[PDB]
Amino acid sequence: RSYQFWDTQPVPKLGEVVNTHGPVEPDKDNIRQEPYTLPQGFTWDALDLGDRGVLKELYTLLNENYVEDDDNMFRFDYSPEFLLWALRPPGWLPQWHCGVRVVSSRKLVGFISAIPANIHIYDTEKKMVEINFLCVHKKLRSKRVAPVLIREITRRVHLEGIFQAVYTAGVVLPKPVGTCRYWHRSLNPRKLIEVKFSHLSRNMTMQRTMKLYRLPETPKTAGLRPMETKDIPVVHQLLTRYLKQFHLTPVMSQEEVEHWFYPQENIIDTFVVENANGEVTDFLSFYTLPSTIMNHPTHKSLKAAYSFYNVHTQTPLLDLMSDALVLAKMKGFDVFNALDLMENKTFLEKLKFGIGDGNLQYYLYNWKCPSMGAEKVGLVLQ
Ligand SMILES: CCCCCCCCCCCCCC(=O)SCCNC(=O)CCNC(=O)[C@@H](O)C(C)(C)COP(=O)(O)OP(=O)(O)OC[C@H]1O[C@@H](n2cnc3c(N)ncnc32)[C@H](O)[C@@H]1OP(=O)(O)O
Ligand SMILES: COc1cc([C@H]2SCC(=O)N2c2cccnc2)c(CCCN2CCN(C)CC2)cc1O
């Protein structure tokens, strides 16, 4: 369109209207046994994240070289313990933690990952992988290293008999199946304005701004409490039933639900509504992901909470999310982030979220299907 790399790949063209559902190419019956060639002086290395030293190397690569905002002011700061959560879910494979190192110094300069996931896309369930944490060191940018990382992880996934993948990106590539928008809810507006994440309205004083965003000290929903081990099955049951209404969703086992939702401090929070009868009827969840405030003398970090999966059957969704905001404020978050997917548009403007810059595009690899509105997207990635 022209895309030197993406034009060679089994994905639909940008601008082509798709009215069919299925693979772009058939499953491969023989697969390349040898890794793709990297530029000279660089080598492949599978990263054992159970090793404290290797995990920290990955932490640093991403801390210094991962996604920045459009103004080049903030960079994601995934913690080592978060990366362990995100990258070793049930069924994780060691070959799918794909690093690139400088041969001489051993410096980690590139990475890409796959984790397994069963994905429901319209009327089909497929075993896929989710691709995440594609990163190339700043000093290595614009040298066509990304295509080698993408082809190499493809080869490694192919060896395991898997021929479809799902991924998101803030850039337009062939061809989005869904387009989402970022929204932000101020919790600590004074800090957000000071570090220039947000700006003071010409029509509002700082005093008025703090008043606008002020929240109750405690949640209002009767019987809200953190998720416990006994809650794992009912949380699985609630999520599975809730997700049916959307066109792009994960299909989680009970073991997967335990991994993704069981609370871990500073990583993942899940709160359930246990009613007057002792029945769990609702749950909210958010993950923890701080950002580095680049080159700032006094404020070094911003603590952000990210809306994950929120299931309602008896409690209004609006009330659930109001309580999520209160809980995040209690836990010291500066901002609460959510996408416009699932039923989120029903609460975003009401709870004083504001729209952010940029788009999050959702993609499938080797699967043609019609595109969908954000409201039909029911998949949230890390
Ligand atoms: C069956 C199994 C299938 C498994 C595979 C499924 C596919 C997985 C796909 C990956 C899902 C990743 C999900 C996430 O992790 S999204 C997060 C991506 N990470 C970042 O944005 C971190 C900071 N940025 C970087 O590290 C970048 O500069 C990267 C590494 C992204 C590009 O490095 P560099 O800037 O040095 O560029 P290049 O000269 O090497 O190569 C340029 C080519 O790369 C295409 N490009 C640029 N950005 C992306 C992007 N985010 N997804 C896919 N492709 C991208 C670009 O259009 C061009 O192709 P084309 O325009 O010529 O055609
Ligand atoms: C500044 O506001 C935004 C910040 C971010 C992200 S990017 C790194 C970061 O730390 N972010 C952050 C900071 C503080 C709180 N939550 C998030 C985003 C996400 C957009 C992702 N894109 C858009 C497209 N491409 C390629 C650049 C990054 C949106 C914001 O409107």
The domain spans of the chain are 1-382
Residues in contact with 318: Cβ distance below 8 Å, sequence separation at least 6, in sequence order = 346, 347, 350, 351
Spatial contact of 363 and 167, defined as CB atoms under 8 Å apart: yes
Spatial contact of 141 and 29, defined as CB atoms under 8 Å apart: no
- Cα–Cα distances (Å) from 138 to 62, 63, 109, in that order, read 11, 12, 9
Tell me if 314 is assigned to a ligand binding site: no
Spatial contact of 255 and 117, defined as CB atoms under 8 Å apart: no
> Is the distance from the beta carbon of residue 182 to the nearest atom of ligand 2 less than 6 Å?
yes
The matching CATH number, chosen from 3.40.50.720, 3.90.180.10, 3.30.420.40, 3.40.630.170, for 1-382 is 3.40.630.170
Method of elucidation:
X-ray
Tell me if 144 is assigned to a ligand binding site: yes
Rounded to the nearest 10 degrees, the angle between the axes of helix 254-261 and helix 232-243 is 100
- Whole-angstrom Cα distance, residue 261 to residue 226? 10
Resolution of the determined structure in angstroms stands at 1.7
- Determine the distance separating the centroid of ligand 2 and the alpha carbon of 28, expressed in angstroms: 37
- Determine the distance separating the centroid of ligand 1 and the alpha carbon of 124, expressed in angstroms: 27
> Is the distance from the beta carbon of residue 69 to the nearest atom of ligand 2 less than 6 Å?
yes
- Whole-angstrom Cα distance, residue 101 to residue 104? 9
Residue minimizing CA distance to atom 16 of ligand 1: 169
- Which residue, 70, 351, 24, is CA-closest to 186? 351
How many residues in total does the chain contain? 382
Q: Residues lining ligand 1, judged by CB closer than 6 Å?
A: 3-6, 66-67, 129, 131-136, 141-147, 150, 153-154, 157, 162-165, 167, 169, 171, 173, 365
Residue minimizing CA distance to atom 5 of ligand 2: 69
Tell me if 145 is assigned to a ligand binding site: yes
